[PDB]
């Protein structure tokens, strides 16, 4: 398809804040890696440093960090004081957005009305999101230790407490919507996670949106700003840090990687428009491709078969002879297994044309920037293509060679070299979970192609396979029966679902809750450990895997095929429990010191271990891989040996509807045969109830739907299989998705604009709609906007919402609505059309039209895992530790000093955050 021009670039990398500064550092072979400090960890790092294999410790503090960056919050379309109170994650993304648009010459342009943004991002806790959840666990730990040790015992806060805006918990998807609002973008926006490949996934999909005309300009970039303690504990349990402290991509002596943080952004336009408008072109994206490794390797290990495949797909897409590639910016992280596999893959592919391109890795200078890792790689390659110079890979003294000696150090510049027919470069990124991307780049040019291929025309999507697990409605058949009988799944909180925290009077007082709300909780799931290869994986991933597997079977899918897996989700907020455990190391030490009780080292470790085990289990290898959101999509692709892209997609409540839009685009721009769209939100956690209370009151009793003033608790997971309508048979089809459309904003006007677009796309009139599936969230501003817009649009249609049956499932809520609607249309025995409306914290309105089809769809070691976990207080107060008796006697009758910083509960109080429709922070 058409050449894409890069017309603006920005970076915030370890060591640099602008592309020319970064380039000069590369030319000078600057090492930008450094040791983490309390600025990164919020604690003294030495207290958490030990040897490999030591529990709750990391064995390496080296990384690529962002030091001495002072964000300027002025000059955006959102108020300075609001933006100043957001995490590095948000601020770094806003910074590179402003810089990249200003570089391209479009900051504040009316052209931004047709500009979208796709953002690679980690679904991990951030330094700010921790502040919103830690006091839940630590108040309970504090009160248990008072009961065990001394009524005046006081636990210290995990770090210096800071007042923290609730929006800092919207980690995965909201940063992309915030960029769109703060820069005035009017096009599509979402975040995605493809682990180390997310930057090139974002660029490739943004090119796709340009090729289908969904936008006339796109921002594509990524940000890596997770809590460094969470990141480094993970790479320590993975044993990914080098035992000899040598991180040296391509070097024989390298034993591992160092991780890193930062952000990057690029501005993309079709080359025809860039030449017409007189933009500065940095480079041409000639083509590229995505792939998944499919079956064969552990979720953290690369598979050469998927890497060769993405090369084949990329040069075919670019229509470029692989003989012409001069330089490849490699994924090479310094991990031995991965460095050798990538060298084998490149040997296999390029030896077919007898080409030996130069090779390099900017991970040598910066570390591995995780979701942002592709940004410095692509920036290096595009600047090298424009300037005709290739910077060195640093610290490379004794280079590896490929399996058969095809590539050696002769192809790896260790100084700046001149460039070795357009100058042509490849960029490769190979992420955890088998997620691969390769982009083909060429030097900038004003010359337009005379002939290029075009995207396929869009078609309605046919839903051919579905499964659902909402509350106690544990499969599609049970959900269908529930809906037809107008029943609900509302129940009291399962005993272990909040780890017993609903019994803590101080926590519940802070949350202003008389009781845990009645709601559609999932108490447990049954799963076949044999089929799914299950140190257990967290329920977020197990729930998604089960429904996706069932939907794939229901849709008649076939193993080994080019099928994509998109998972709509936001972060598992229960991931904060892991640092909730780990941080008690210094919290308990500080408490004992400050209060004046001098235990032995062995007594203090035993006391600390008892408290830790109450909160969470110590990190284990497989369990930590399930903390990584994109891996749940990869696990399905590995089970089915699928080769399409496998990613998570995050856009808050509109996550699923952005997946529908993406699936349509994937069929237009690639040869993918089917797309699984799965969705999961275990939104009955205490963390989610805490978070959503900041936006409006919950219905504690769990019991015109638009007239409700409180939201209902629910949780679960569901999945659908979609194919283009022209490629399914009648007996497969539940219902068709005829249109999905979006409009910026959250008010009644935005609803009518999105609805008009969707009705036009579907080819029907508003009077053709039989009924309306309202969002009906129970947040008053959203309900009130729908009460205005929907009866006006559809005066003769009845309005209802699936949330009345199974509650508000937040990041999965679009899937509940689609599946309810598809089941109803599949039952039609009256051409019938139903509209679905969507609102959320992403500040856009989604509107969908679904339609009935000719026929009803034709149907084709089990272990129980409970959600939640061990009761925190009981695990501490009833501990069977023998040495606990002697510790209690060291406390008996003593006067304790007050601690300097006790656990603070202020951030738990419902914050009263105004809805997007109020425009409270719009300048
Ligand atoms: Mg092309």
Question: Gap between N and C termini, in Å?
Answer: 39 Å
CATH superfamily of the domain at 4-143 and 159-442: Thiolase/Chalcone synthase
- Strand residue percentage: 15-25%
Shape: globular
Approximate helicity band? 25-40%
Structural class: alpha/beta
Number of helical segments with 4 or more residues: 30
**CATH class value of the domain at 4-143 and 159-442:** Alpha Beta
**Largest beta sheet, briefly?**
20 strands, mixed
Number of strands: 29
Keywords: PUFA synthase, PKS synthase, Ketosynthase, Chain Length Factor
Assembly: monomeric
Entry title: PfaC Keto synthase-Chain length factor
Name: ORF10
Report on this model:
- This protein has 923 residues and is an alpha/beta fold.
- It contains 30 helices and 29 strands.
- The protein has a 20-stranded mixed beta sheet, sandwiched between helices. The protein has a 3-stranded mixed beta sheet with strand order 2-3-7, with helices on one face.
- α26 links the parallel β25 and β26 (798-800).
- The longest helix is centred in the first third of the chain and has 20 residues, at 129-148.
- It is globular, with a radius of gyration of 27 Å.
- Magnesium ion is lined by residues 1, 3, 286-287, 318.
- Keywords: PUFA synthase, PKS synthase, Ketosynthase, Chain Length Factor.
- The assembly is monomeric.
Question: How would the blueprint of this fold be written?
Answer:
Layout: E1 4-12, H1 19-27, E2 34-35, H2 38-41, E3 62-64, H3 80-84, H4 88-104, E4 115-121, H5 129-148, H6 174-183, E5 189-193, H7 198-211, E6 217-224, H8 228-237, E7 259-260, E8 262-270, H9 271-277, E9 283-292, H10 304-318, E10 327-329, H11 336-350, E11 358-360, H12 363-366, H13 374-387, E12 389-390, E13 417-418, E14 424-431, E15 435-442, E16 461-470, H14 476-484, H15 505-510, E17 519-520, E18 524-528, H16 529-532, H17 539-554, E19 563-568, H18 576-582, H19 584-595, H20 601-615, H21 621-625, H22 629-640, E20 646-650, H23 655-669, E21 674-681, H24 686-693, E22 713-714, E23 716-724, E24 735-744, H25 748-762, E25 769-773, H26 780-793, E26 798-800, H27 803-806, H28 813-826, E27 833-838, E28 844-852, E29 862-866, H29 872-877, H30 884-889
Parallel strand pairs: 3-7, 4-5, 4-6, 10-11, 10-14, 17-22, 19-20, 19-21, 25-26, 25-27
Antiparallel strand pairs: 1-8, 1-9, 2-3, 5-20, 6-8, 9-15, 12-13, 14-15, 16-23, 16-24, 18-29, 21-23, 24-28, 27-28
Helix pairs in contact: 4-6, 5-18, 10-11, 17-22, 18-20, 19-20, 25-26
The structure holds magnesium ion.
Residues 1, 3, 286-287, 318 line the site of magnesium ion.
Organism: Moritella marina
Protein name: ORF10
Binding site for Mg(2+): 1, 286
């Amino acid at each position: 398809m058409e050449n894409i021009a890069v017309v603006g670039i920005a970076n915030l990398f370890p060591g640099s804040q602008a592309p020319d500064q970064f380039w000069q550092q590369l030319l000078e072979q600057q090492d930008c890696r450094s040791k983490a400090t309390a600025v990164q960890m919020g604690v003294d790092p030495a207290k958490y440093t030990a040897n490999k294999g030591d529990t709750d410790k990391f064995y390496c503090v080296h990384g690529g960090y962002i030091s001495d960056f002072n964000f300027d919050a002025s000059g955006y379309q959102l108020d300075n004081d609001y933006l100043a109170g957001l995490d590095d994650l948000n601020q770094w993304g806003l910074y590179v957005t402003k810089q990249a648009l200003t570089d391209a010459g479009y900051w504040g342009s009316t052209a931004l009305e047709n500009c979208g943004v796709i953002l690679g991002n980690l679904s991990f806790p951030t330094k700010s999101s921790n502040q919103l959840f830690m006091p839940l666990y630590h108040q309970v730990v504090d009160n248990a230790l008072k009961a065990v040790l001394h009524p005046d015992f006081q636990l210290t806060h995990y770090t210096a407490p800071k007042k923290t805006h609730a929006d800092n918990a919207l980690v995965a998807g909201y940063p992309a919507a915030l960029i769109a609002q703060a820069a005035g973008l009017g096009g599509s926006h979402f975040a995605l996670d493809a682990a180390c490949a997310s930057s090139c996934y974002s660029v490739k999909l943004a090119c796709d949106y340009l090729h289908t005309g969904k936008a006339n300009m796109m921002l594509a970039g990524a940000v890596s700003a997770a809590d460094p303690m969470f990141v480094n504990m993970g790479f320590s349990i993975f044993q990914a840090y080098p035992a000899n402290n040598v991180h040296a991509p391509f070097d024989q002596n390298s034993q591992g990687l160092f991780a890193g943080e930062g952000a990057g952004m690029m501005v993309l336009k079709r080359q025809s428009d860039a030449v017409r408008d007189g933009d500065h072109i940095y480079a041409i994206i000639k083509g590229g491709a995505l792939s998944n490794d499919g079956k064969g390797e552990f979720v953290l290990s690369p598979n050469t078969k998927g890497q060769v495949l993405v090369y084949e797909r990329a040069y075919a897409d670019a229509d470029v002879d692989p003989s012409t590639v001069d330089y490849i910016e490699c994924h090479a992280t310094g991990t031995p297994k991965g460095d050798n596999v990538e060298l084998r893959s490149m040997e296999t592919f390029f030896s077919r044309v007898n080409n030996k391109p130069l090779l390099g890795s900017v991970k040598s200078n910066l570390g591995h920037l995780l979701t942002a890792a592709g940004m410095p790689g692509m920036t290096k390659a595009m600047l090298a293509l424009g300037k005709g110079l290739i910077p060195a890979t640093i610290n490379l003294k004794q280079p590896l060679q490929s399996k058969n000696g095809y590539f050696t150090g002769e192809q790896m510049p260790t100084t700046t070299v001149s460039w070795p027919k357009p100058r042509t470069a490849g960029v490769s990124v190979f992420g955890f979970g088998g997620s691969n991307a390769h982009l083909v780049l060429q030097q900038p040019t004003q010359t337009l192609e005379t002939n290029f291929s075009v995207a396929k025309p869009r078609e309605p999507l046919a839903i051919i396979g579905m499964d659902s697990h909402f509350g106690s409605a544990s499969n599609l058949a049970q959900f269908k029966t529930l809906l037809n009988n107008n029943q609900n799944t509302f129940r009291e909180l399962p005993e272990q679902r909040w780890k017993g925290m609903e019994s803590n009077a101080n926590v519940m007082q802070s949350l202003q809750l008389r009781k845990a709300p009645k709601g559609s909780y999932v108490e447990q799931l049954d799963i076949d450990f044999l089929r799914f290869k299950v140190d257990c994986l967290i329920p977020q991933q197990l729930m998604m895997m089960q429904v996706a597997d069932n939907a794939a079977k229901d849709g008649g899918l076939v193993e080994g095929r080019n099928v994509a897996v998109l998972v709509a989700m936001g972060m598992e907020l229960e991931l904060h429990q892991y640092r909730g455990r780990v941080n008690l190391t210094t919290q308990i030490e500080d408490s004992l010191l400050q209060q004046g009780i001098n235990l032995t080292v062995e007594q203090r470790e035993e006391l600390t271990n008892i408290a830790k085990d109450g909160v969470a289990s110590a990190a284990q290898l497989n369990q930590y891989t399930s903390f990584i959101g994109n891996i749940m999509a990869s696990r399905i692709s590995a089970l089915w040996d699928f080769s399409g892209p496998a990613i998570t997609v995050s856009a808050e409540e509109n996550s699923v509807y952005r997946c529908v839009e993406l699936a349509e685009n994937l069929f237009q721009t690639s040869d993918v045969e089917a797309v699984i769209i799965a969705a999961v939100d275990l939104s009955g956690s205490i963390e989610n109830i805490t978070l959503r209370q900041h936006y409006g009151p919950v219905n504690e009793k769990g019991s015109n739907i638009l007239d409700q003033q409180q939201w209902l608790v629910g949780e679960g997971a569901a999945a659908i299989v979609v194919k283009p309508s022209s490629q399914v048979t009648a007996e497969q089809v539940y219902a068709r998705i005829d249109a999905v459309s979006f409009a910026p904003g959250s008010n009644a006007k935005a609803i009518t604009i999105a609805a008009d677009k969707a009705l036009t796309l579907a080819g029907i009139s508003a009077a053709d709609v039989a009924s309306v599936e309202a969002h009906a969230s129970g947040f008053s501003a959203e309900n009130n906007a729908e009460k205005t817009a929907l009866p006006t649009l559809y005066p003769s249609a009845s309005i209802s919402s699936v949330k009345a049956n199974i509650g508000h499932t937040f990041n999965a809520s679009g899937m509940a609505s689609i599946i309810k609607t598809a089941l109803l249309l599949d039952q039609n025995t009256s051409s019938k059309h139903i509209a679905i409306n969507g609102l959320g914290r992403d500040n856009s309105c989604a509107h969908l039209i679904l339609s009935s089809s000719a026929q009803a769809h034709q149907v084709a070691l089990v272990k129980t895992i409970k959600l939640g976990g061990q009761l925190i207080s009981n695990a501490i107060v009833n501990s069977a530790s023998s040495s606990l008796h002697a510790i209690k006697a060291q406390f008996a009758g003593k006067h304790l000093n007050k601690v300097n910083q006790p656990v603070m509960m202020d951030n738990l109080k419902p914050q009263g955050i105004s809805a997007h429709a109020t425009n409270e922070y719009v300048v």
